[PDB]
From Swiss-Prot:
GO BP, sorted A to Z: proteolysis
Any one GO MF annotation of this record: aspartic-type endopeptidase activity
Protein family according to the UniProt entry: Belongs to the peptidase A1 family.
Peptidase A1 domain location: 17-328
Full-sequence portion shown in this chain: 90 to 419 of 419
Active-site residues per Swiss-Prot or TrEMBL entry: D35, S199
Organism from which the protein derives: Cryphonectria parasitica
Keywords for this protein: Aspartyl protease, Disulfide bond, Hydrolase, Protease, Signal, Zymogen
Catalysed reactions listed for this entry: Hydrolysis of proteins with specificity similar to that of pepsin A, prefers hydrophobic residues at P1 and P1', but does not cleave 14-Ala-|-Leu-15 in the B chain of insulin or Z-Glu-Tyr. Clots milk
Keyword Membrane: no
Class of the enzyme per the UniProt entry, highest EC level: hydrolase
Name of the protein in question: Endothiapepsin
Gene: EAPA
Length: 330
C-alpha cells in the first residue's frame, strides 16, 4: 500500500504545516501537524476542556463506530517550545492520503496549553519520530508510520514541504518526479528516538564550504533551523545590522535586508536554503525589525533541522531495519 497527502502552510510565514487526516467511522477529518520530532498522535476532542478550544475541529469518539477506549491509558507530552497537552486514549481507524491503519492509538486531549488553544488551524499532531518516544502509559503505543510500515510497498515516508506553498507527505514510495538530481542517504542514530544525523558542514551565501560535523535532528514540527552559536554568528555577520536580541529571543535583522543563502552538507552533497526562506517577517506588526530563520541551538541541547532547512529539500525518512535519511534538491 501507499498514501499521499497534501500539506499546507498554516499562515503566510510557513510557521507550521497541516495535513488532513481521516479518523473514525464515518470519517472525521482533522488537520494535523505532522511532526518527525515526536511520536504521539493526539487530537483536540469532545473531551478537551471547553475553554481551551478556540476554533479547532474536534474528534468525537462517541460518534465513531470503530472507536474503542484504551482502558487505563493516559498520555502527557511537553514540547521543546514549552507547549504541552495530555489526556486519555482511544484506538480507531486512521487514514492519511488513502493509507489506512486500523487500531491506531488516537490520543484524546483533555488539556492543552495556551499556544495550542491560540492556534485555530492545528487540530492536533501526528508524530513520526521513533515509537520509543511515545508517551502513552502504562503501555507505550506505536506511531502511524510504525503501524503502517509492514503494509507499505517500501518502509519509507517522504516530506516535500513548500516555501509559501503546499507540499506533500508520501508513505510507502519515493516519487522520482518530485526532486532533481540524486538522493544522498546518510546514517541515522535512533538512540534519542529522533531522526538524528550528522551534517558534513555549511556555507554562508557564496562563501567557501566549512567542513565540520553537525549532529542534529530532522524535525518537521519545528519551524526554524537551530544550529551551533558559532555557525549562526557566521551567518548573521553577513547581514548588515543583524544582531542577537535577548528581549526578542534571537537574531533579528533589518527588514530592508537581502538575506544570503545558507548551504548545509549531506555527505558530499549540498542543500541550498535560499535567503528568502530565512525571513520570518516583522517581530511585531508594523516593525522594521525582522525575525531570523536561523537561530542558535545553545541551551536547547540539540541542533534542529526544522522546516527552514527541510523545505529546501526532498527528504526521505527510510524506516528500514537500519534507518537512514535521504536528501535531494528540488
Amino acid at each position: 500500500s501507499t498514501g499521499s497527502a497534501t500539506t499546507t502552510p498554516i499562515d503566510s510565514l510557513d510557521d507550521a504545516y497541516i495535513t488532513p487526516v481521516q479518523i473514525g467511522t464515518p470519517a472525521q477529518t482533522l488537520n494535523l501537524d505532522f511532526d518527525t520530532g515526536s511520536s504521539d498522535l493526539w487530537v483536540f476532542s469532545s473531551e478537551t476542556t471547553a475553554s481551551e478550544v478556540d476554533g479547532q475541529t474536534i474528534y468525537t469518539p462517541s460518534k465513531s463506530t470503530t472507536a474503542k477506549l484504551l482502558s487505563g491509558a493516559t498520555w502527557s507530552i511537553s514540547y521543546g517550545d514549552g507547549s504541552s497537552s495530555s489526556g486519555d486514549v482511544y484506538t480507531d481507524t486512521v487514514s492519511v492520503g488513502g493509507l489506512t491503519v486500523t487500531g491506531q492509538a488516537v490520543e484524546s486531549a483533555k488539556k492543552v496549553s495556551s499556544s495550542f488553544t491560540e492556534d485555530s488551524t492545528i487540530d492536533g499532531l501526528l508524530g513520526l519520530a521513533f515509537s520509543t518516544l511515545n508517551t502513552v502509559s502504562p503501555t507505550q503505543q506505536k506511531t502511524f508510520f510504525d503501524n503502517a510500515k509492514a503494509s507499505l510497498d517500501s518502509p519509507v515516508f517522504t516530506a516535500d514541504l513548500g516555501y509559501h506553498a503546499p507540499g506533500t507527505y508520501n508513505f510507502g514510495f519515493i516519487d522520482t518526479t518530485a526532486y532533481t538530481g540524486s538522493i544522498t542517504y546518510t546514517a541515522v542514530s535512533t538512540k534519542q528516538g529522533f531522526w538524528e544525523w550528522t551534517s558534513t558542514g555549511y556555507a554562508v551565501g557564496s562563501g567557501t564550504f566549512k567542513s565540520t560535523s553537525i549532529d542534529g535532528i530532522a524535525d518537521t514540527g519545528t519551524t526554524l533551523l537551530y544550529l551551533p552559536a558559532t555557525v549562526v554568528s557566521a551567518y548573521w555577520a553577513q547581514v548588515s545590522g543583524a544582531k542577537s536580541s535577548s528581549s526578542v529571543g534571537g537574531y533579528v535583522f533589518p527588514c530592508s535586508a537581502t538575506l544570503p543563502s545558507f548551504t548545509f552538507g549531506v555527505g558530499s552533497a549540498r542543500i541550498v536554503i535560499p535567503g528568502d526562506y530565512i525571513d520570518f517577517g516583522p517581530i511585531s506588526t508594523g516593525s522594521s525589525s525582522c525575525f531570523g530563520g536561523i537561530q542558535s541551538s545553545a541551551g536547547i541541547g540539540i541542533n534542529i533541522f526544522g522546516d527552514v532547512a527541510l523545505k529546501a529539500a526532498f527528504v526521505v525518512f527510510n524506516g528500514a531495519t537500519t534507518p537512514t535519511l535521504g536528501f535531494a534538491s528540488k
